[PDB]
Structures are given as structure tokens and as C-alpha cells.
Ligand SMILES: CCCCCCCCCCCCCCCCCC(=O)OC[C@H](COP(=O)(O)OCCN)OC(=O)CCCCCCCCCCCCCCCCC
Ligand SMILES: CCCCCCCCCCCCCCCCCC(=O)OC[C@H](COP(=O)(O)OCCN)OC(=O)CCCCCCCCCCCCCCCCC
Ligand SMILES: CCCCCCCCCCCCCCCCCC(=O)OC[C@H](COP(=O)(O)OCCN)OC(=O)CCCCCCCCCCCCCCCCC
């Protein structure tokens with residue numbers, strides 16, 4: 001189709017022009033003008049919780065686009081999925097894993 | 103935290119938004135220097151001068 | 163070279179270029195309008211002398227920031243320091259790249275859509291991380307750890323907040339999302355999704371009240387890149403919110419671009435009102451609200467949306 | 477279509493090659509992110525749109541973010557790593573590279589002797605992937621949630637500060 | 639029109655490159671990075687195999703693969719942080735207390 | 739008449755780079771971001787100028803960057819203490835070209851009333867100053883007038899457009915002093931309101 005190749009060209013032009021525009025303004029800023037603690041593990045815990053819940057979120061992303069086709073059985077399966085996820089979140093909250101200040 | 107505390111906090115945030123919007127719907131309090139000249143009281147302590155008598159000679 | 167296919171290709175390329183130029187000038191003029199609207203909220207005027215109504219203040223800022231002395235620290239990594247503003251600009255710019263502004267006026271009619279928005283936000287966190295590392299300052303390093311922890315703690319439910327609109331539309335396409343809002347806008351059924359997406363979009367843009375410094379070592383054009391990328395990102399989040407929860411371009415009387423621009427500008431004004439009104443919460447309550455409250459709210463909202471959809475499908 | 481696949485595959489190969497031979501951890505992770513973007517481009521050229529979407533959302537958006545988080549947490553200034561150059565001495569890397577090359581030729585000889593009509597590149601949408609995920613693969617989803625929970629519990633138990 | 643063999647060759651090249659990085663690097667962090675490269679190459683091979691046959695099985699197995707990869711990266715980084723906390727170095731050859 | 743810094747010279751200003759110089763000077767003078775540096779009571783009047791009753795935001799001088807890298811103008815508003823003088827000099831060195839200095843108040847001008855053992859007698863002893871404001875404290879509109887004076891000072895100075903092409907020295911105009919310019923109207927004042935009324 002003509003529309004799809006035109007849309008692909010438009011998206012390619014958008015990406016190229018945006019990247020080249022930011023590069024060109026960086027080059028212009030570089031060109032113009034004359035011259036003259038130990039981090040705790042709570043950050044790791046927060047990032048790891050983000051990673052795990054993001055993978056469970058990707059499973060929910062896959063489910064949400066096909067709710068009608070999956071029927072009530074898919075709703076039941078996602079209900080057990082979300083219940084397990086919420087049990088894990090409640091477990092994390094209740095043991096102080098998500099609490100910053102002790 | 104308590105759910106009542108969360109509801110009270112949401113209500114007071116909404117009140118803050120509404121009253122800031124009402125302040126936006128109010129009149130400006132800006133004196134526009136230098137287009138608007140600054141009113142100074144007669145005994146204001148600014149630039150120092152030397153003056154003259156009614157006869158016209160210097161008073162110092 | 164006279165052929166309708168080449169004419170259509172050139173027209174679509176020009177349409178995408180026009181959209182991009184309007185977006186970058188809208189972000190810069192929105193930085194100026196943020197200054198003006200903060201003046202309006204705080205019972206003052208703001209910049210109104212540089213040109214007619216202050217409209218040339220942005221040009222003065224751009225000329226100053228272009229002709230300022232470009233500085234890279236002596237004991238810093240040059241590639242990462244240069245690359246952080248690149249990410250802070252381009253990531254949320256190409257997050258805008260999927261937004262449909264009008265029927266027949268779109269850049270990319272992708273099958274992923276707000277999935278691509280999620281890819282772009284996950285790329286956008288690297289700007290804060292890289293700016294913190296490349297500064298060679300432990301204060302900016304700790305500030306970047308805190309800012310990146312906040313952005314991760316709210317990107318953990320950004321997509322799940324969008325999943326309600328995904329479920330009701332039945333597809334990831336933005337055109338299908340704005341077509342499914344032909345009768346009732348998504349703000350009414352997906353109200354919890356609407357507030358959670360508002361909070362997540364505020365937090366991932368490093369705006370009031372979810373912010374903080376990792377900006378101290380940048381100056382000149384790199385700081386201007388971070389600034390204009392932040393405002394372009396606010397435009398991006400506002401337009402995505404309009405196209406996801408308020409019907410996008412759909413309206414009774416006005417042309418579709420008029421309705422889309424009016425809703426987008428209203429959300430930008432609401433952003434400035436949020437910045438002017440709300441105070442700064444502390445870190446512990448911010449992360450506790452991000453994890454304990456908003457994420458289960460998005461999960462329960464997705465479950466209720468699925469139950470309502472399957473109940474309404476006879 | 478094939479142009480994007482070949483260019484992105486070459487970019488990913490070069491980026492991974494620069495990953496395994498680098499001393500700076502942040503530069504190695506940046507080249508790894510570039511390779512992940514290229515591999516997602518390969519995914520999008522093959523019609524697996526969900527694969528590329530989850531490659532940049534999760535693999536280049538969560539896992540690499542966690543790696544950069546750990547690297548900047550450790551403040552790795554290359555102590556006894558930047559000053560050693562041990563992997564660049566040929567007496568260290570000639571052996572394993574020869575072994576991996578031999579395995580690569582064996583796998584390539586195995587690959588070249590299979591029936592291949594080519595890939596049509598028809599876009600497999602995320603809708604069909606979600607249909608198969610919550611259809612014939614229900615137990616896979618539930619036990620994968622169980623596995624993610626187990627990994628979360630173990631990483632919490634190990635990575636505490638006290 | 640893209641051959642399946644070329645995608646499988648790309649996946650094999652990435653797999654042996656990640657394994658070479660896993661072997662020749664004495665750092666635990668670069669070992670974990672090479673492990674990440676290997677599991678990503680295996681997921682790439684599964685995606686190519688699934689897209690050749692026109693099935694969602696490849697993408698489903700990729701989803702399971704990246705779930706495992708995320709969990710394994712979390713586990714290895716937790717162990718790396720424990721090692722760096724209790725030994726102040728990431729030398730994988732120095733941690734050889736039991737042998738024979 | 740101009741002064742060099744790399745010497746009293748003349749005006750060196752085809753026509754294209756002249757318009758470029760005016761545009762660069764216009765962009766620099768219309769967008770000046772002061773550095774948030776709190777020293778003493780003069781900074782209290784500076785932030786009084788920053789509020790809504792005086793509207794320093796109209797001149798585009800309200801961003802108030804907390805880092806000296808992002809700031810173009812240092813407003814030394816307060817006493818130059820001996821302990822704080824290395825801090826002032828280090829913060830001035832952290833700023834990047836182009837940089838201008840406004841001394842606000844008699845303390846920053848000359849030490850003011852505090853000719854004492856622990857006060858440096860003026861910030862011009864160690865950093866160069868572009869604009870001086872008498873007062874203790876100067877009122878906020880006096881600070882805005884000094885900002886305008888700095889604006890017309892910048893508006894005719896000459897600086898290199900790029901670091902690779904042209905003369906890299908900086909030109910500063912030897913402006914006519916405000917005292918001799920305003921003497922024509924100041925001396926002609928004959929009567930003022932008596933101090934017994936409001
Ligand atoms: C500093 C620069 C760093 C590198 C930046 C990127 C470099 C490359 C720039 C040039 C790109 C040229 C254009 C590439 C093709 C664009 C069009 C495309 O991808 O089309 C394929 C597909 C079409 O989708 P659809 O229309 O729904 O299909 C139905 C029928 N075909 O659509 C899709 O599959 C869409 C999904 C893929 C879109 C990819 C967009 C770019 C991703 C990388 C962003 C990098 C951000 C900066 C760096 C971050 C930190 C490393
Ligand atoms: C396009 C996208 C953007 C759209 C723009 C428009 C929408 C903007 C949304 C902004 C959201 C801001 C959210 C701020 C959350 C702050 C949470 C927090 O940390 O609250 C802490 C505070 C105290 O908590 P506690 O632990 O009890 O501390 C007491 C200890 N002695 O807790 C409290 O005080 C309790 C209340 C917490 C906050 C509840 C939510 C308030 C949200 C702000 C008001 C929004 C009102 C509607 C605006 C218009 C919407 C169309
Ligand atoms: C040019 C020489 C090199 C210059 C420096 C490097 C620049 C970046 C090079 C890689 C990225 C761009 C590759 C070229 C893409 C051009 C567009 C294209 O080939 O589109 C084909 C196809 C469109 O979709 P489809 O429906 O399949 O179309 C079939 C046509 N009927 O497309 C698809 O199906 C998917 C297209 C690819 C996926 C989207 C883009 C991914 C970009 C990944 C960038 C990774 C980082 C690169 C960093 C480079 C610098 C270090």
C-alpha cells in the first residue's frame with residue numbers, strides 16, 4: 001500500500017530530524033561563544049521491585065489487549081495472577097522492604 | 103496511613119488549588135517600575151544634596 | 163517525477179516535520195508560558211517587555227544559551243555527559259511521536275502505541291542516570307539515585323494505569339483508543355486510571371511535586387536541552403492524556419484540532435497550577451504513595467474494568 | 477525490511493563485541509543497551525512486535541537500569557580492574573576465543589543444513605500473543621508469576637543491608 | 639523474505655560472544671553481563687524460530703525467557719552486592735575457598 | 739571608546755557581523771539570570787525585588803539558578819567578610835563567560851559602615867565589578883535600575899561570536915557616568931516636599 005510506505009517514510013523522517021535537530025543544537029552550543037559517600041541497598045531493593053513488578057506488568061499488558069477473546073476463564077487466570085502479585089506486594093510492605101526510613 | 107487522613111489531605115490539596123486559582127482571578131499588586139514612578143515619602147532618605155537660602159547663596 | 167504516490171509521501175513527510183516543529187516551538191513557548199502563568203497565579207505579570215507581550219524572551223534565551231561558553235568538566239566522561247541531554251530531549255519527543263492530533267494527521271500509526279510510550283519513558287530514565295554518573299560529583303550522584311528511584315517507583319504503575327484504556331479499547335492503537343471514545347470519554351469509566359496516570363506522568367517528568375541536584379554541572383546548551391526536553395515532555399504527557407482519557411480530537415462543534423489544542427492547553431495550565439499550589443512532600447511518603455497506594459489501585463481498576471467489559475459482552 | 481534486519485544485526489554484533497572487551501562498566505552497559513535496541517529493531521523487522529516492545533520496555537528499560545543502578549552504587553573506579561588489562565593479554569583470551577569460534581562453526585554447520593523457505597515477516601500482533609498466553613499457556617503464566625515471586629524473595633533476602 | 643538461517647546465525651554469534659565475555663572476564667559484573675547476553679541471544683533465537691513458523695509460541699517463550707532473565711539478573715546482582723559488601727572486591731578467582 | 743581585556747581602544751565595528759553582534763548582545767542583555775547568593779540584608783532587598791510587588795520577572799531575570807554554571811550575573815549583595823571572601827571568589831571562578839558583577843549596597847561597594855577587622859573593604863578588591871549600587875540597603879527598584887544600566891552596558895559591548903574565528907578579546911564600552919549625565923537635571927531641582935507630611 002502507498003499509505004503504509006508513506007507512513008514509514010514519515011516516521012523515519014521524524015526520528016532522523018529529531019535526532020539530527022538535537023545533535024545540531026548541541027553542535028551549535030559547542031561552536032558559538034568564546035572561552036576564558038556509600039550508597040545503601042534500598043536503591044537496589046527499589047530497582048529490583050521495579051524489575052519484578054514490571055515483568056508481571058508485561059504479563060498484564062499481554063492480557064489486557066485480549067480480554068474479550070479470553071472470556072471469563074482468562075479473567076479467572078488473571079485474577080489469580082493479580083492476587084499472587086498483590087500478596088507479594090503485601091508481603092513486601094509488611095516486612096519493611098518498601099519502607100525507606102527505619 | 104489512615105484513609106481519613108488521605109481524604110482530608112486530598113480535600114486540602116483541592117482547597118489549595120482552588121484558592122491559588124482565586125488568587126489568579128484577583129487584581130495585580132505590582133508597581134511597574136520604571137513606567138510607573140515610585141512614590142517616595144517627603145522624608146525619604148535617598149540622594150544627598152546641598153541647598154541654598156531664599157536669598158540664593160549656598161546654605162553651607 | 164509527477165506521481166500521486168511521491169506527492170503523498172512528500173505530504174506525509176511534511177506533515178510529520180510540521181508536527182515536530184510545532185511541538186518543539188510549543189515546548190519552548192510553554193517554558194515562557196510557564197513563567198507567564200506563574201506570574202499570573204502569583205498576582206504579578208512576568209516577562210512582558212521583550213517584544214510584544216514578552217514573546218521574544220524565548221529568542222533571547224536561545225541566543226544567550228547558544229552563545230554561552232560550552233563547558234565539559236575536566237575530570238568527567240565526555241560521551242555520557244554529552245549523551246544525557248540527548249536522551250532527556252529525544253526520548254520523550256519520540257514518546258510524543260505516536261500521538262494523533264487529527265484524523266489524517268498522525269506521524270506513526272503503530273500497532274503498539276502507548277507500549278511505545280512505555281519504551282520511550284524507560285529510555286528516558288537513562289537521562290537522569292547518565293547525568294548523575296557523568297557529573298563526577300557525589301552530591302549529584304546521590305540526587306540522581308533519588309530521582310531515578312522516584313521515576314522507577316512511578317513507572318512501575320504508569321503502564322498499568324494505561325491498561326484500563328487498553329482494555330476498554332481492546333487494542334494498543336491510539337486511533338482505536340480515540341475511536342472508542344465516540345460516546346463516553348475515558349475519564350468517566352477509567353477515573354482511577356486517569357488519576358494514577360496523572361500522578362505517574364507528573365512523576366516521570368521530574369516536575370512538581372516529585373523532584374529532587376544533578377543539574378548543577380550542566381550549563382549553556384546542555385542545560386537548555388534538559389529544560390526544553392522537560393517542557394516538551396510535559397506537552398507529550400498532556401497530549402497523551404488528552405488522547406487517552408478525554409477523547410483526543412473528538413468534539414461536537416469546533417474543528418478537531420481546536421478541541422485537541424484546547425484540551426492540551428488546559429492540561430498544560432493545570433500543570434502550572436499544580437506547580438504553583440502544591441508543596442513538596444518528603445521522600446518516604448512519596449515512595450510509599452507510589453508503591454502501596456497507586457499500584458494496587460491500578461491492579462484493582464484493571465480487574466474491575468475486565469469484569470465490567472466481560473459482563474457487558476453478551 | 478531485510479535492510480533493517482541486517483543493519484541492526486551488525487550493530488548488535490559490534491556492540492556486544494565492544495561490551496565483552498571493555499573496561500569501563502558504564503560504557504559496557506551503554507554498548508549493551510545499544511545492542512538491546514538493535515536486537516529490538518531485529519525483532520520489529522521480523523514481525524514480532526511484542527518481542528521488540530518488551531525488549532526496550534523491560535530488557536533495556538528495567539534490567540539494564542538495574543545494572544546501571546548497581547554499577548553507580550558500587551562506584552566502580554576500576555580498582556584492580558582498569559590497571560590489570562588481564563583479558564587483553566593473548567595468553568588469556570586466545571584459548572576461549574578459539575573454543576567459542578569452534579563452537580560457532582559447529583552451530584553454523586548445524587544451522588545451514590535445515591529446511592528454510594525464509595521468513596515472510598507478517599506482523600504477529602500482541603493480541604494473538606495475549607490470546608495464546610491466557611489460552612493454551614495458563615499454567616506457564618501462573619508459574620512464571622511464581623518464579624518472579626521466588627526471585628524477588630531471594631533477592632530481598634540476599635541484598636539486605638542490616 | 640529474510641532467511642531463518644541468517645537469524646539463527648546472528649543468535650549463535652551473540653551467544654558465543656556472551657559466553658566468551660563470561661569466560662575471559664574475571665569481574666563478576668562482566669560475567670553477569672555476559673550471562674545476560676547469552677540469555678538474550680537464546681530469546682532472539684526463539685523469536686526468530688517462532689516468526690519463521692508464524693506462531694505465537696516463539697514470543698511466549700521469549701516472554702518466559704525475559705522473565706527468567708530479569709529474575710536471574712536480580713539474583714546475580716544481589717549476590718554481587720553481598721560479595722562486594724563482605725569482601726570489598728569482585729574478584730571471582732579469589733573466591734575459591736573450597737576445592738578438591 | 740572601548741577597553742580591552744584578553745588597553746584603551748576604539749570601536750572596531752561589512753555589515754553582517756555587526757547585526758550578529760547586536761543580536762547576540764540583545765539576547766544576552768534581555769535574558770540575564772542572576773546567581774542566588776545570599777550574604778546579608780542587601781540580599782533580602784534583592785529577593786524583595788524578586789517578589790510580586792516589584793516584578794523583576796518582567797526583565798527576564800527571575801529564573802534564579804542555584805548553580806553558578808547556569809548563571810550569567812553575580813549580584814554580590816551583602817558584606818564581604820574575610821571568611822566568606824574565598825567562597826565569593828570560588829563562586830565567581832565557577833561561573834562561565836560571559837559574566838557580569840553587580841555590587842549591591844555600600845558593603846559590597848566599599849565595605850560601607852563596616853570598616854572593621856573582619857570585613858573586606860569592597861568586593862572590587864578581588865573580583866571585577868560591572869555595576870555599583872549605593873544604598874544600605876538599596877531599594878528593589880534601585881536594583882532593577884542597576885539591572886537596566888547593566889543591560890545598556892551589555893548592549894554595546896563587543897564579544898567574539900565563536901571560539902575559532904575572530905578576535906578573542908573582550909571589549910567593554912567606556913560609558914558616560916550617571917553622575918555627569920544626571921547632573922543636568924539634578925542641579926535644577928529647587929523645591930521638595932516638607933518632611934512634616936505623609
Ligand atoms: C542518539 C541516537 C541513538 C540512536 C537512535 C535511533 C537510531 C536510528 C534512527 C533512524 C531510524 C530510521 C527509521 C526506522 C524505521 C521506522 C518505521 C518502523 O519501525 O516501521 C516498522 C513498524 C511499523 O508498524 P505498523 O505500521 O504498525 O506495521 C503494520 C504493517 N507494517 O514500526 C515499528 O516497529 C515501531 C517500533 C520501532 C520504533 C523504533 C524507534 C527508535 C528506537 C530507539 C530510540 C533511541 C533513543 C535514544 C537513545 C537512548 C539511549 C541509548
Ligand atoms: C497530564 C498528566 C498530569 C495531569 C495534571 C492534573 C493532575 C495532577 C495530579 C498531581 C498529583 C500529585 C500527587 C501528590 C501525592 C503526594 C503523596 C504524599 O506523599 O502525601 C504525603 C502526605 C502526608 O502523608 P503521611 O504519611 O500521613 O504524613 C504525615 C506524617 N506526620 O499525605 C497527605 O497529605 C494525604 C494526601 C496525599 C495526596 C492525595 C492526592 C492529591 C493529589 C493532588 C490534588 C489533585 C486535585 C485534582 C486536580 C485536578 C485534576 C483534573
Ligand atoms: C545508514 C548507515 C548507518 C548510519 C548509522 C546508524 C543509523 C541507525 C541504523 C539502524 C536503524 C535504522 C535501519 C534502517 C531502517 C529503515 C526503515 C526500514 O527498513 O523499514 C522497513 C520495515 C518497515 O516495516 P514493514 O511493514 O516490514 O515494511 C516492509 C515494506 N513493505 O521496518 C521494520 O519492519 C522495522 C525497522 C527497524 C526497527 C525500528 C528502528 C530500530 C532502530 C534501532 C537503532 C539501534 C541503535 C543504533 C545506534 C547506531 C550508532 C551507534
Ligand SMILES: CCCCCCCCCCCCCCCCCCCC
Nearest residue numbers: 181184185188263264417419423426
Ligand atoms: C499542543 C498542540 C500540538 C500540535 C502538534 C501538531 C500540529 C499539526 C498541525 C496541523 C494543522 C492542520 C490540522 C488539520 C486541519 C483542520 C484544522 C484546521 C485549523 C487548525
Ligand code: SF4
Nearest residue numbers: 779843844845874875
Ligand atoms: S550595605 Fe547595609 S543593608 Fe547592605 S549588607 Fe551592608 S549593612 Fe546590610
